[PDB]
Nucleic acid binder design. Sequence first.
RNA 1: GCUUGACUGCGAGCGUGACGGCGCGAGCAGGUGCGAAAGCAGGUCAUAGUGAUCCGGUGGUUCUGAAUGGAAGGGCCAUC
RNA 2: UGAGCCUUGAUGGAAGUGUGGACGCCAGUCUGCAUGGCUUUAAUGUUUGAUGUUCUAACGUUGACCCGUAAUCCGGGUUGCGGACAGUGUCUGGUGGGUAGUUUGACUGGGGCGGUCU
RNA 3: GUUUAUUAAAAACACAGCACUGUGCAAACACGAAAGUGGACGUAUACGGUGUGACGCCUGCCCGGUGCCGGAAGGUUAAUU
RNA 4: UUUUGUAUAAUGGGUCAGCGACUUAUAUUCUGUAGCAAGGUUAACCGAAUAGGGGAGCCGAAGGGAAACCGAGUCUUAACUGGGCGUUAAGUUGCAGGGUAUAGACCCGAAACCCGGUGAUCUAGCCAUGGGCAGGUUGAAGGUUGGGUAACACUAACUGGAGGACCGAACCGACUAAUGUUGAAAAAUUAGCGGAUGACUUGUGGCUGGGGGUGAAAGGCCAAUCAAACCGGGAGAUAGCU
RNA 5: AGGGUGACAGCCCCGUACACAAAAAUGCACAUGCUGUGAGCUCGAUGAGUAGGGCGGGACACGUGGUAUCCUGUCUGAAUA
RNA 6: UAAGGUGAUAUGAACCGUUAUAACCGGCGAUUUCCGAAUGGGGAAACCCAGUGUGUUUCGACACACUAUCAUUAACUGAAUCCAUAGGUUAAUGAGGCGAACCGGGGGAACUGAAACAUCUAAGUACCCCGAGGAAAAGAAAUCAACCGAGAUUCCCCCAG
Lengths: 77, 149
Amino acid sequence: SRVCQVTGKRPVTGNNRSHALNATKRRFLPNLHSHRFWVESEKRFVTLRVSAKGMRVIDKKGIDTVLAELRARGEKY
Amino acid sequence: MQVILLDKVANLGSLGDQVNVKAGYARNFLVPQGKAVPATKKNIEFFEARRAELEAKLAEVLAAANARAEKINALETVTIASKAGDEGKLFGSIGTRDIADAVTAAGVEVAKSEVRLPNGVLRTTGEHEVSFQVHSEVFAKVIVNVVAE
RNA sequence: GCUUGACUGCGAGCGUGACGGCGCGAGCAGGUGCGAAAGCAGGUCAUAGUGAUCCGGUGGUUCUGAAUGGAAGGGCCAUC
RNA sequence: UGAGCCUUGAUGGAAGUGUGGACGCCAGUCUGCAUGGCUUUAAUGUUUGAUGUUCUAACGUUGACCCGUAAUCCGGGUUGCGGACAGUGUCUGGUGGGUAGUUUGACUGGGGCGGUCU
RNA sequence: GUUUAUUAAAAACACAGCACUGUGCAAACACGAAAGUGGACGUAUACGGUGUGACGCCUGCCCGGUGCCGGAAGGUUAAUU
RNA sequence: UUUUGUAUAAUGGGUCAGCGACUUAUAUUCUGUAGCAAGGUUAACCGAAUAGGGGAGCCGAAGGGAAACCGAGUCUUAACUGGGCGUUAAGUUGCAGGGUAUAGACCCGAAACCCGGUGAUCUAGCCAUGGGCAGGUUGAAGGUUGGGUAACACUAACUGGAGGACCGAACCGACUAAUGUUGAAAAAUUAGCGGAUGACUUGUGGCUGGGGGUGAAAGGCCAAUCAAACCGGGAGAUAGCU
RNA sequence: AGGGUGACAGCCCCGUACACAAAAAUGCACAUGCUGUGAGCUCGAUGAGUAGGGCGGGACACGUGGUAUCCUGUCUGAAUA
RNA sequence: UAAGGUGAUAUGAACCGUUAUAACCGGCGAUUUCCGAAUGGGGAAACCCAGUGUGUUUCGACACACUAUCAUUAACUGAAUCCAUAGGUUAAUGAGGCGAACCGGGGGAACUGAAACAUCUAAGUACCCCGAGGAAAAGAAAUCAACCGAGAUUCCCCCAG
Ligand SMILES: [Mg+2]
Ligand SMILES: [Mg+2]
Ligand SMILES: [Mg+2]
Ligand SMILES: [Mg+2]
Ligand SMILES: [Mg+2]
Ligand SMILES: [Mg+2]
Ligand SMILES: [Mg+2]
Ligand SMILES: [Mg+2]
Ligand SMILES: [Mg+2]
Ligand SMILES: [Mg+2]
Ligand SMILES: [Mg+2]
Ligand SMILES: [Mg+2]
Ligand SMILES: [Mg+2]
Ligand SMILES: [Mg+2]
Ligand SMILES: [Mg+2]
Ligand SMILES: [Mg+2]
Ligand SMILES: [Mg+2]
Ligand SMILES: [Mg+2]
Ligand SMILES: [Mg+2]
Ligand SMILES: [Mg+2]
Ligand SMILES: [Mg+2]
Ligand SMILES: [Mg+2]
Ligand SMILES: [Mg+2]
């Protein structure tokens, strides 16, 4: 459903605001690329709908600290 | 992305060393494949003792075979008469075994692999300054009293 | 021939416009030029040769400037 | 292969008799390979951009199998192919009646044309 | 053959035929924010688009303008730095 | 009623009865009237609720300047002049009215625009599965036999049975005229007319939904509606016009 | 107060003020029992892909304006009393 | 509570009660077919079809009861692959659907006004969607203030068109 999945970054809406300042709803959407992660500890190759930056999170907090959450809120994975 | 290395890793390996590398190289290869691990302190700022539990620990408190020259230098006269004969010469020669052998204090035991002698002690009998060269820079000194029978 | 009155600040009082404006103006203060002097000069003999407001640009100013000192920005005067 | 850097060069243990490279006010000479009583600028490492290759390990596969499963979807696994490409997100130049919203003056002896507008 | 159900049946549309052009297959293209689907369980003797409109004899000259195709060496040039 | 002007052959009204259009809220300014007066007056709220309390606050008694500032003066300017605006003004708060502002703003009225739903029982395409076409005519390809050839061509009879083939009912359609035109009928009747084994015709069910569909292309059809359907909503759209 | 009664009623009727009433069921207050929670005291700690930043939008009365502050799709990214 | 009663158009019939549950009023319960979230599967709503059982039975079988999906947990099972997961079965709970306004959030017009129209307006309105409560939301300063100080949020009047 085009959701960051790891940081719940959904696609927000906005205006194109062309020159002359002309309104036109456009809506911005996250990056996402569904990556293949190696939990290692769980010895499984889990894959998530992770999105840019949100990927920097995993590499910052923990592939297990992340999966710690996610599974906490009751998400898939 | 630093991560402490865990092996050879071509242009950057030390079986344990931090090095700035692209996260694309990690979390894709230098990791998930057993070759490194993120520098999360818990593996360095806390797991640095592994690098300080030898050269800095098992190299200082390693008290055991460091006091060689000291432990051995006041023996009970290492008399090793390498025999003699024929106009006052010798029947036995001096080598690596006999030397670091008779040099035993109280029924102790010394490996003959710890001798300090350039060449081979030609057959004589006079003062034989047989130093007990054990460790590299940590060797000792002993003697031998060759004569006859 | 000599010069910069095509000056600065004001202006009794009038004309002409629905208004925004526009025009005429003696005389007053400061300072100029020409003339011996009285005096004349605030552009051209007069009536066309033109663009409001906004938004800004440039110079000046101890007017203002959000805790205070500055500053940005704003006002004011000159001006594009 | 461009640019950094500074590392090593010219700038500014003895002769003498071959050979490259440097360009010159030259008629110079400069400097590296036998036998012999700080800038102006270049190799080394390095950093970094520019393409061009190769690799696998992300990523793709509407190839082939296995299992879920007496399934054509889907998921996991194995293998092959492709491979940091493709594709997508944000930003950005071009294109864009495909679509959308509008504008397209007045006087005028009817309107239009012509002319006019201070 | 088709068409303006309810004023137009036609010289209009359609057609077989012709020509141009796109498309190498996860085709072009089209419906769809997407997944997916038609094209086609087809694969250039195939599919889409456009114009001409059996058949016969034919289909001349112009590439300056516009579009499209190729080149891109150089001039101008976005974000970015 | 609208007009320079209407008996006007210019508009509206068959008649009657009932209903039908300058409102309301807050604000601001005058006029009248009442209260108090260099002062007038409270808001919310409290409340022994129309009291009383509450003066937060608003207006006025001071103005000039762009302002700092100054002050019955102050700006302008170097400025003494002068000139502009002020100073020998009573205001304030209710109540009723005239006017304006914001609102639907006197009342009725568009053609349209936007949002969400309902519609392929009509019709246009298509998909699945069933049905229909009296009668009569033509006579292709192929084959057989004779001839013919070196063998094929070729030829002739017979056989054969093709075709968006022919004539013509059912069936589908719709070229002509009359009649109908407050019809029998919101497209028909009557006499002729076109196709009638085909791009045919029909039953049943299904799929395309509105800026969307469908279209052998007329802007045609999408429920007697179509250069953007119907229903509900924005909504009392707006209407310098009648 | 009000309504009815064969015309308009305090005194006909039902009411009316006033005063009473609950087997049971429950709203809400207190009060307590069961479960859960956990008070209090010492010494600690004191919220990072975050705050800021560049690009695009959006919200602040404030239409990028000299424009603070807030949210963020996208790329980054600190101090830590 | 009571001398009257068996609701209405509704009389009549046939009855019940005049003391103490006749009727009637209120509290709590029993029954409560079929459709409808509809939940055994299906289905053109109020109908069609099934599995496993229970007890009773002439013991044919009867009707009746349970059997949807998902979520959490528990237990037992269990692929590619040792393990392990994925998947499977069961059970216990909870959800589902209705709803008038108010409330929070996601998405979001145009007519209109600007006497034209793009910025702007209408308006974050109409409308669609999701969620929750009796209220919602918000809320104990990285708040204002101005060198004096104030002290969460929310609502009213002023400040001020
Ligand atoms: Mg002249
Ligand atoms: Mg257009
Ligand atoms: Mg419009
Ligand atoms: Mg005109
Ligand atoms: Mg025909
Ligand atoms: Mg016709
Ligand atoms: Mg033609
Ligand atoms: Mg032709
Ligand atoms: Mg030609
Ligand atoms: Mg007239
Ligand atoms: Mg008349
Ligand atoms: Mg009347
Ligand atoms: Mg025929
Ligand atoms: Mg007929
Ligand atoms: Mg016929
Ligand atoms: Mg049908
Ligand atoms: Mg119709
Ligand atoms: Mg409206
Ligand atoms: Mg109207
Ligand atoms: Mg059922
Ligand atoms: Mg069901
Ligand atoms: Mg307008
Ligand atoms: Mg303080």
